[PDB]
């Protein structure tokens, strides 16, 4: 017997997480998904599933799984849910209205905040339109906020579209960095590729 | 082409309250971030508060000096934003301006700065 | 979004039964996980029961297992809490809560977006 376990370690324990605007996607397929690895964890700030019970995750098969991950600030984690609005849901990472899957987050202040501010983590503050679900925009075009053209240069009412969180360890809990993992579960008209343990 | 008229300013004693109104004409404010700024003569413009298109507490920002004392809000049906000022100090004396731009969202560091009202004087004294 | 209206609480004698109802309004009811919490004077909101979209699973606080039953009528937009063999220790404000998500940490108040105003339950001796 060969039991290819889905590499959830590579997702949850990654040393580096993506900026939310450049959110990372890892395909999870042709593997046994064993969620029991998370059962004895208690420092996740949120762990919610949509269309499936967390209690049944080891008892279900899916045609495909994606693991999306990124960093946002604590009071933005509420936007990583179906039917949300705000700067993250609108301009950075958009879940579908009928999302099937799980959203897990945890405070990463210790790893991701620096005295003086961590400027490595960015989000998109400006966009002409909202993202479609699971859309990614990594464009760096200067945003026209006023009546005057920008000509691809920063200036008055002409803003670089990405802005830094500048995470500092003494930020309020709502402004501290949180690492987020979104597990997307597909149930298409195709063979199951991801099942819980037998 | 959006036009903004601040009102509600006047003389108030320390500890008193005031509600500023920023009424927009010629365009809808509803899709856009709006900010309150203030300027005392001699000192440059500074941001007071910023509200985003989602009008959520998490996307609404205040400068350190007014946190806990001032509340910004919007009524999209009246095309109007408010600054509720309680526990007014002498140091709150200034001309109050509202501004908007084409951004949907405030950041702590980036308020709208494209279109401005003429402003309303707020004086906290005897 | 979703409004929650509790009812069926009030005064009952030790040993007696009550049935709380919460009507959820404004969104597809079977899209929401429904829960009951309770708050005694000077205490935190304590988890009582929750019920997933389909009616399964159900979850119970250790102190009400075998005494309380949570159920939902997806046609009536209503969640129920049947409370039997009530003790004085069950006296508290009972809150209806709702969320689109089912939490692994289902006992956490912070995992529920929507909250009723609560209704008083008083069990006298
Ligand atoms: C992360 O690594 C720890 C050991 O350092 C391990 O016990 C845990 O299972 C890993 N997480 C996942 C999701 O595999």
Author numbering:
A (entry chain EEE): 331 to 528
B (entry chain FFF): 2 to 127
C (entry chain BBB): 3 to 127
Passage from the reporting paper:
The structure and binding properties of three of these nanobodies (A8, H6 and B5-5) have been characterized in detail providing insight into their binding epitopes on the Omicron spike protein. Binding of the SARS-CoV-2 spike protein to the human ACE-2 receptor at the cell surface is the first step in viral entry and blocking this interaction correlates with neutralization of infection. Structural analyses have mapped out the epitopes of these nanobodies on the RBD and have shown that the majority cluster in two regions: one on the side of the RBD, distal from the human angiotensin converting enzyme-2 (ACE-2) receptor binding interface (cluster 1), while the second are close to or at the ACE-2 binding region (cluster 2).
We determined the crystal structures of the three nanobodies A8, H6 and B5-5 in complex with isolated RBDs to resolutions of 2.37, 1.73 and 1.97 Å, respectively. H6 was crystallized in complex with the Beta-RBD, whereas A8 and B5-5 were solved in complex with the Wuhan RBD. To obtain diffracting crystals of the A8 and H6 RBD complexes, a second nanobody was included in the crystallization trials, H3 and F2, respectively, that bind to orthogonal sites. H6 binds directly at the ACE-2 receptor–RBD interface and completely occludes the site of ACE-2 binding and corresponds to Cluster 2(21) nanobodies. The residues in the binding site recognized by H6 in the Beta variant are largely conserved in BA.4/5 and later variants, BQ.1, XBB, BA.2.75, though the mutation N460K in these later variants is likely to mean the loss of a hydrogen bond with R54 in H6. In BA.1 and BA.2, there are three other mutations in the Omicron RBD compared with the Beta and Wuhan that are located close to the H6 epitope, K/V417N, S477N and Y505H. None of these would be predicted to result in clashes or loss of key binding interactions with H6. Collectively, these changes may partially account for the reduction in binding affinity to the Omicron BA.1 and BA.4/5 RBDs compared with the Beta RBD.
